[PDB]
Enzyme design. Structure first.
Site, PDB file in Angstrom:
ATOM      1  N   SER A 116      -6.144   0.605   0.564  1.00 11.00           N
ATOM      2  CA  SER A 116      -7.601   0.358   0.684  1.00 11.00           C
ATOM      3  C   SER A 116      -7.654  -1.099   0.532  1.00 11.00           C
ATOM      4  O   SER A 116      -8.063  -1.648  -0.665  1.00 11.00           O
ATOM      5  CB  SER A 116      -8.124   1.173  -0.459  1.00 11.00           C
ATOM      6  OG  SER A 116      -7.961   1.072  -1.512  1.00 11.00           O
ATOM      7  N   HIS A 144      -8.232   8.086   0.238  1.00  7.65           N
ATOM      8  CA  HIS A 144      -7.055   8.560   0.451  1.00  7.65           C
ATOM      9  C   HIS A 144      -6.569   9.775  -0.369  1.00  7.65           C
ATOM     10  O   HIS A 144      -5.276   9.892  -0.794  1.00  7.65           O
ATOM     11  CB  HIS A 144      -5.832   7.430   0.211  1.00  7.65           C
ATOM     12  CG  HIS A 144      -5.860   6.533   1.467  1.00  7.65           C
ATOM     13  ND1 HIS A 144      -6.529   5.818   1.687  1.00  7.65           N
ATOM     14  CD2 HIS A 144      -4.668   6.229   2.366  1.00  7.65           C
ATOM     15  CE1 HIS A 144      -6.588   4.960   2.854  1.00  7.65           C
ATOM     16  NE2 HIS A 144      -5.587   5.561   3.350  1.00  7.65           N
ATOM     17  N   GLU A 188      -9.795   5.771  -8.609  1.00  2.00           N
ATOM     18  CA  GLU A 188      -8.465   5.730  -9.762  1.00  2.00           C
ATOM     19  C   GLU A 188      -9.287   6.058 -10.989  1.00  2.00           C
ATOM     20  O   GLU A 188     -10.363   5.251 -11.766  1.00  2.00           O
ATOM     21  CB  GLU A 188      -7.779   4.626  -9.839  1.00  2.00           C
ATOM     22  CG  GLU A 188      -7.050   4.320  -8.566  1.00  2.00           C
ATOM     23  CD  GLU A 188      -6.499   2.906  -8.560  1.00  2.00           C
ATOM     24  OE1 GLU A 188      -6.258   2.498  -9.542  1.00  2.00           O
ATOM     25  OE2 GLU A 188      -5.916   2.592  -7.253  1.00  2.00           O
ATOM     26  N   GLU A 201       0.348   7.390  -5.572  1.00  2.00           N
ATOM     27  CA  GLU A 201       0.798   6.643  -6.722  1.00  2.00           C
ATOM     28  C   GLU A 201       1.003   7.624  -7.974  1.00  2.00           C
ATOM     29  O   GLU A 201       1.101   7.114  -9.210  1.00  2.00           O
ATOM     30  CB  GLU A 201      -0.393   5.733  -7.257  1.00  2.00           C
ATOM     31  CG  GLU A 201      -0.587   4.739  -6.473  1.00  2.00           C
ATOM     32  CD  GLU A 201      -2.201   4.268  -6.551  1.00  2.00           C
ATOM     33  OE1 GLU A 201      -2.963   4.443  -5.368  1.00  2.00           O
ATOM     34  OE2 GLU A 201      -2.578   3.948  -7.524  1.00  2.00           O
ATOM     35  N   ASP A 258     -10.739   2.424 -11.439  1.00  2.00           N
ATOM     36  CA  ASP A 258     -10.977   1.383 -10.161  1.00  2.00           C
ATOM     37  C   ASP A 258     -11.797   2.197  -9.185  1.00  2.00           C
ATOM     38  O   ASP A 258     -11.501   3.336  -8.438  1.00  2.00           O
ATOM     39  CB  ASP A 258      -9.485   1.343  -9.338  1.00  2.00           C
ATOM     40  CG  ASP A 258      -9.601   0.455  -8.088  1.00  2.00           C
ATOM     41  OD1 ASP A 258      -8.695   0.464  -7.442  1.00  2.00           O
ATOM     42  OD2 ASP A 258     -10.703   0.062  -7.905  1.00  2.00           O
ATOM     43  N   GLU A 273     -13.193  -1.665 -12.218  1.00  2.00           N
ATOM     44  CA  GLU A 273     -12.626  -2.281 -11.042  1.00  2.00           C
ATOM     45  C   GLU A 273     -13.480  -2.123 -10.069  1.00  2.00           C
ATOM     46  O   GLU A 273     -13.739  -0.903  -9.737  1.00  2.00           O
ATOM     47  CB  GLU A 273     -11.024  -2.197 -11.153  1.00  2.00           C
ATOM     48  CG  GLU A 273     -10.577  -2.745  -9.543  1.00  2.00           C
ATOM     49  CD  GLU A 273      -9.072  -2.402  -9.512  1.00  2.00           C
ATOM     50  OE1 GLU A 273      -8.305  -2.027 -10.302  1.00  2.00           O
ATOM     51  OE2 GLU A 273      -8.431  -2.525  -8.101  1.00  2.00           O
ATOM     52  N   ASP A 325     -11.164  -7.034  -7.483  1.00  2.00           N
ATOM     53  CA  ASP A 325      -9.934  -6.638  -6.773  1.00  2.00           C
ATOM     54  C   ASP A 325     -10.138  -6.963  -5.117  1.00  2.00           C
ATOM     55  O   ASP A 325      -9.945  -8.183  -4.570  1.00  2.00           O
ATOM     56  CB  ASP A 325      -9.361  -4.976  -6.744  1.00  2.00           C
ATOM     57  CG  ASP A 325      -8.242  -4.658  -5.870  1.00  2.00           C
ATOM     58  OD1 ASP A 325      -8.128  -3.449  -5.535  1.00  2.00           O
ATOM     59  OD2 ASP A 325      -7.491  -5.602  -5.355  1.00  2.00           O
ATOM     60  N   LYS A 331      -2.648  -9.558  -7.032  1.00  2.00           N
ATOM     61  CA  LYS A 331      -1.738  -8.800  -6.001  1.00  2.00           C
ATOM     62  C   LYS A 331      -1.255  -9.884  -5.146  1.00  2.00           C
ATOM     63  O   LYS A 331      -1.940 -10.511  -4.286  1.00  2.00           O
ATOM     64  CB  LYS A 331      -2.457  -7.797  -5.223  1.00  2.00           C
ATOM     65  CG  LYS A 331      -3.114  -6.635  -5.930  1.00  2.00           C
ATOM     66  CD  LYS A 331      -3.827  -5.690  -5.190  1.00  2.00           C
ATOM     67  CE  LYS A 331      -4.068  -4.339  -5.671  1.00  2.00           C
ATOM     68  NZ  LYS A 331      -5.255  -3.693  -5.078  1.00  2.00           N
ATOM     69  N   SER A 349      -0.803  -6.016 -10.264  1.00  2.00           N
ATOM     70  CA  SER A 349      -0.940  -4.850 -10.006  1.00  2.00           C
ATOM     71  C   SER A 349      -0.005  -4.387  -8.576  1.00  2.00           C
ATOM     72  O   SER A 349       0.354  -5.164  -7.788  1.00  2.00           O
ATOM     73  CB  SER A 349      -2.533  -4.489  -9.212  1.00  2.00           C
ATOM     74  OG  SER A 349      -2.603  -3.215  -8.713  1.00  2.00           O
ATOM     75  N   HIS A 350       0.265  -3.123  -8.692  1.00  2.00           N
ATOM     76  CA  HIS A 350       1.020  -2.542  -7.482  1.00  2.00           C
ATOM     77  C   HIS A 350       0.152  -2.470  -6.200  1.00  2.00           C
ATOM     78  O   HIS A 350      -1.237  -2.875  -6.362  1.00  2.00           O
ATOM     79  CB  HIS A 350       1.630  -1.200  -7.821  1.00  2.00           C
ATOM     80  CG  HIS A 350       0.714  -0.309  -8.081  1.00  2.00           C
ATOM     81  ND1 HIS A 350      -0.811  -0.258  -8.408  1.00  2.00           N
ATOM     82  CD2 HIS A 350       0.852   1.050  -8.190  1.00  2.00           C
ATOM     83  CE1 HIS A 350      -1.427   0.759  -8.542  1.00  2.00           C
ATOM     84  NE2 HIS A 350      -0.358   1.646  -8.426  1.00  2.00           N
ATOM     85  N   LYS A 394      -1.145  -2.557 -13.788  1.00  2.00           N
ATOM     86  CA  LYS A 394      -1.349  -1.190 -13.445  1.00  2.00           C
ATOM     87  C   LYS A 394      -0.066  -1.075 -12.027  1.00  2.00           C
ATOM     88  O   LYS A 394      -0.306  -1.858 -11.403  1.00  2.00           O
ATOM     89  CB  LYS A 394      -2.805  -0.992 -13.025  1.00  2.00           C
ATOM     90  CG  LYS A 394      -3.432  -1.425 -11.924  1.00  2.00           C
ATOM     91  CD  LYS A 394      -4.766  -0.837 -11.189  1.00  2.00           C
ATOM     92  CE  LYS A 394      -5.142  -1.415  -9.953  1.00  2.00           C
ATOM     93  NZ  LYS A 394      -6.280  -0.556  -9.551  1.00  2.00           N
TER      94      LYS A 394
HETATM   95  C1  LIG Z   1      -5.389   1.953  -3.347  1.00  2.00           C
HETATM   96  C2  LIG Z   1      -4.913   0.570  -4.325  1.00  2.00           C
HETATM   97  P1  LIG Z   1      -4.112  -0.580  -2.832  1.00  2.00           P
HETATM   98  O1  LIG Z   1      -3.177   0.183  -2.007  1.00  2.00           O
HETATM   99  O2  LIG Z   1      -4.034  -1.782  -3.546  1.00  2.00           O
HETATM  100  O3  LIG Z   1      -5.504  -0.840  -1.873  1.00  2.00           O
HETATM  101  C3  LIG Z   1      -3.892   0.991  -4.955  1.00  2.00           C
HETATM  102  C4  LIG Z   1      -3.888  -0.382  -6.327  1.00  2.00           C
HETATM  103  O4  LIG Z   1      -4.390   0.658  -7.509  1.00  2.00           O
HETATM  104  N1  LIG Z   1      -5.653  -0.674  -6.034  1.00  2.00           N
HETATM  105  O5  LIG Z   1      -6.284  -1.517  -7.009  1.00  2.00           O
HETATM  106  C5  LIG Z   1      -5.920  -0.158  -4.783  1.00  2.00           C
HETATM  107  O6  LIG Z   1      -7.262  -0.504  -4.358  1.00  2.00           O
HETATM  108 MG   LIG Z   2      -7.476  -1.012  -2.305  1.00  2.00          MG
HETATM  109 MG   LIG Z   3      -8.373  -1.595  -6.708  1.00  2.00          MG
END
Ligand SMILES: C[C@]1(P(=O)(O)O)C[C@H](O)N(O)C1=O
Ligand SMILES: [Mg+2]
Ligand SMILES: [Mg+2]
Ligand SMILES: C[C@]1(P(=O)(O)O)C[C@H](O)N(O)C1=O
Ligand SMILES: [Mg+2]
Ligand SMILES: [Mg+2]
Lengths: 433, 433
Positions: free
Chosen positions: B39, B157, B166, B209, B244, B292, B317, B342, B369-370, B393
């Site tokens: 996303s 997703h 999240e 994840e 999130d 977030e 983010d 990121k 972040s991942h 995270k």
């Molecule tokens: C879905 C995710 P990305 O793949 O970074 O878009 C996973 C991460 O935890 N995050 O902050 C998101 O928004």
């Molecule tokens: Mg995202």
């Molecule tokens: Mg995010």
């Protein structure tokens, strides 16, 4: 040669503790980690767990870790052996543990050190790991394996009703290992769409090894989905199917229960002969070329009869547990024609190589395998190349404890360059290449 | 100083192609790989895909790989620049690309090299990577972060109706990082049991994840499940909750759709004021300490207003995309008080460190972040320690593209010995340590 050994508790891919070993020599740090099975055979070497129910629900491996750091490490450091002497070092550990099933230290303690020794020995020889392994086994012509990707999952650690454990695709028809990865990934993503449309938007989360677990009961239905994904991806000619039945998980009172995750009703149970008849239907109707653990681990008669009446690959997993003693019996009774090679079923690199060579000398195939609980470790990628077995199953092309192996095999293929040979349609007997 | 740079296509944790770079110096080989978001914010640097619909469903990265091998590699080699010169090497790549959002070579091409250079630079300095990063950032202290584990998922997703993306657990009350991992894993396993009992044994397959996606609509119910698992595992006083929302994913026409995965119905939509009122209730009723992307990436008014009306952490983010220019605006408008870092949102190590330093100088927290598509690479574990941000995270404690980072953080903690400090309750402002 060995300067220091240090073990620690890490988390495997299911979030459970497992053993990791750091071994030091003059050439540096060599690290390996131990995998852990979900549907383990009763004859597997012992996985030592702490059983402290206040800690990780009793799944800690602090005892195994302490055995390595406090007892195994000084022993190997004192040995006056070079890290290239894998067999002497493994034998030292086997004697020091002194039990048949490695129940003093744990198979997971001993294997961790065995794997780190092997990586350190490769560097000592100035060889890549797969080359060192080839030499330990007496091989010289390396082979890139056909990968076997599980894409549909059932069995005892999947939430659906589907009783058989794994439905896999093998791109025997791919051009290279890198090409095989593309074929596997494309069919997997195709299958996601198929399952999504049919069973719903919530049917495409994944199981422990990255396969889909749609809520179905019919094993033939799983095969039909797989065959549908292959065809829709455009690879009917190039991809075939393997199965891990794991029939030990649903063996009940001398009979087999294909609805064992539903409330118990013995009117359901079928005999091995009925089950055998079902397999024959599968081999007729689908491109199933390999079936693993079709009968219970003690059901030797059923294995010998079924194997004698098919022309496909029949794989011992829980039957053989990578154990030369059980393998010799299986060879004598012709119970199967392929060994599933799992280093932590027997607990040392040297014994696993011995088990591989005993299979191969008797004309069996050998398939190197992951466990359900894996790590970021990629040892088995080099192992399958060095042992030249021609086949590996180490997950769906999803979750990086699986991809780390497949990615590493792509690197090895690249590194071997023009000397790279892909097993392809000779996955059962790659020595002809 | 750089002898060779070779890039290849590997598979990420969802089975999609991504960029891996091998960089050779005199000290050896240094390897890094690039993550990929699911996303992604509209203001992120460009991820370059091939778009060949026949190959990997359009998601090949051969073009980005070629940019590295054909263009970026010989330029940086011919420059003669030492790998310790992160900024100069990064800047040279920005100049070559010549575009604002790295749309010529792709942010994935450029980051691939940027990461590998950083690892090679550490070796040149004879420092562990986290120490080299610390010097690059002008830090002298180091801190182990509080991990934030994504255990319940909804959003664009996930196959449920749940809108918010999240729901995370943060063991702020743990004694150490290694202890934080035990706390997280135990709650994760406990949660699996809670879900199985309330939604069925087929409701516990995992998402991208490693978290669960039970079929629920109400976001408060997700918070109920998490709280129940924390309390069942016995850690109520030591584990708190983070969210999130990823609100940009359900922003519609100036309003927000909390049922956006059901057939479109605009009468459903709520205002930012109503959504903020909902968050106020969550913060009152559950131990939510961090939210977030509570509003859309362009809804500056809603962010500033919310942030002024709460005491919790508010993380940008998609709002900030690790970009100093957008961070400067957020600082000025007081839109949030924490930056999600990121590296591939901005495309280089140097720019990411700049982003981090800008946030910290203005009193922001920073959470490393991942992305949803990860690899076996563990660079961000060293990054979060070297930058001393006190929070990361990088997934549920499940799937080794997540565990690889968590395991590496345990190794770093062990390596730092009694110099290791855990951010704990100071995760938002670790500089007081
Ligand atoms: C879905 C995710 P990305 O793949 O970074 O878009 C996973 C991460 O935890 N995050 O902050 C998101 O928004
Ligand atoms: Mg995202
Ligand atoms: Mg995010
Ligand atoms: C479930 C598994 P294990 O974890 O090894 O018991 C996975 C492997 O594919 N395999 O053969 C199995 O039986
Ligand atoms: Mg098993
Ligand atoms: Mg098996």
């Amino acid at each position: 040669s060995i300067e220091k050994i240090w073990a620690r508790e890490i988390l495997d891919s299911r979030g459970n503790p497992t053993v990791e070993v750091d071994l030091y020599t003059a050439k540096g740090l060599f690290r390996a980690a131990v995998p852990s099975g979900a549907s383990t055979g009763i004859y597997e070497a012992l996985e030592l767990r702490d059983g402290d129910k206040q800690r990780y629900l009793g799944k800690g491996v602090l005892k195994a870790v302490d055995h390595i750091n406090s007892t195994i490490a000084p022993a190997l450091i004192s040995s006056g052996l070079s890290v290239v002497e894998q067999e002497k070092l493994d034998n030292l550990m086997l004697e020091l543990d002194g039990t048949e099933n490695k129940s003093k230290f744990g198979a997971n303690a001993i294997l961790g050190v065995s794997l780190a020794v092997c990586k350190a020995g490769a560097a000592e020889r100035e060889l890549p790991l797969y080359r060192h392994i080839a030499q330990l086994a007496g091989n010289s012509d390396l082979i890139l394996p056909v990968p076997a990707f599980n894409v549909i999952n059932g069995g005892s650690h999947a939430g659906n009703k589907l009783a058989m454990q794994e439905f896999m695709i093998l791109p025997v028809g791919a051009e290279s290992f890198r090409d095989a990865m593309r074929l596997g990934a494309e069919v997997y993503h195709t299958l996601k769409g198929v399952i999504k449309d049919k069973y719903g938007k919530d049917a495409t989360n994944v199981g422990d090894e990255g396969g889909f677990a749609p809520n179905i009961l019919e094993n033939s239905e799983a095969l039909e989905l797989v065959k549908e994904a292959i065809d829709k991806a455009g690879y009917t000619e190039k991809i075939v199917i393997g199965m891990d039945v794991a029939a030990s998980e649903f063996y009940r009172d001398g009979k087999y229960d294909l609805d064992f995750k539903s409330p118990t009703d013995p009117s359901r149970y079928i005999t091995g002969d009925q089950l055998g008849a079902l397999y024959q239907d599968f081999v007729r109707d689908y491109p199933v070329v390999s079936i693993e653990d079709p009968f219970d681990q003690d059901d030797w008669a059923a294995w010998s009869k079924f194997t004698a009446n098919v022309g496909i690959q029949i794989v011992g997993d829980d039957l053989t547990v990578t154990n030369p003693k059980r393998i010799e019996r299986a060879v004598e009774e012709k119970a199967c024609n392929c060994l599933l090679l799992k280093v932590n079923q027997i607990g040392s690199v040297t014994e696993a190589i011995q088990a591989c060579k005993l299979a191969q000398e008797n004309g069996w195939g050998v398939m190197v395998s992951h466990r359900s609980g894996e790590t970021e470790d990629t040892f088995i990628a080099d192992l399958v190349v060095g042992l030249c077995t021609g086949q590996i199953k180490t997950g769906a092309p999803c979750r990086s404890e699986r991809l780390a192996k497949y990615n590493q095999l792509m690197r090895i293929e690249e590194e071997l360059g023009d000397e790279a040979r892909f097993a392809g349609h000779n996955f059962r007997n790659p020595s002809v290449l």
